[PDB]
């Protein structure tokens, strides 16, 4: 269960996260796909008390997901209504390339 990065259309990250959670709970595969998270920050966008914070996206258009790569998790995760494709695929794009321990740690820390 290593973290992976998925590319989606810009502005569709939260909807993709919600739909992927729903398809995890509905389609049946719950022991394959564990967690999803959109890396984000809450900047100090304010105006005389009236806050105006637009959700600060550190990486716009990317989504993090923890999943064991079988040949059906790849099918269910990639065909979610809104994702463009996987990233990191090299060498004929056979399988996506996982993240790194410390990298996942520092992204999941903030």
């Amino acid at each position: 269960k290593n973290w992976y990065v998925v590319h989606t259309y810009s502005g569709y990250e939260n909807k993709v996260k919600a739909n992927l959670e729903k398809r995890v709970e509905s389609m049946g595969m719950q022991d394959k796909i564990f967690r999803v998270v959109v890396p984000e920050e809450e900047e100090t966008d304010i105006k005389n008390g009236k806050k105006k914070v637009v959700k600060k996206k550190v990486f716009p258009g990317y989504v993090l997901v923890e999943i064991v790569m079988t040949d059906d998790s790849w099918y269910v995760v990639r065909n979610t209504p809104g994702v463009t494709g996987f990233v990191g695929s090299a060498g004929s794009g056979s399988k996506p390339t996982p993240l790194l321990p410390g990298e996942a740690e520092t992204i999941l820390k903030r």
Partner: protein, 48 residues
């Protein structure tokens, strides 16, 4: 074709000056290269 290049370059600049992982930076660099290639000659490589 100019607007696509400008958008990709701006996103690449913002992601580089943020401390992004290498995989995402590589994806953005590949996409910028493809956009410039389509600006200079559309259809020569891949799909139009």
């Amino acid at each position: 074709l100019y607007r696509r290049v400008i958008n990709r370059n701006n996103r690449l600049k913002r992601l580089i000056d943020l401390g992004a992982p290498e995989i995402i930076v590589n994806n953005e660099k590949r996409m910028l290269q493809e956009s410039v290639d389509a600006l200079f000659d559309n259809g020569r490589r891949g799909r139009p």
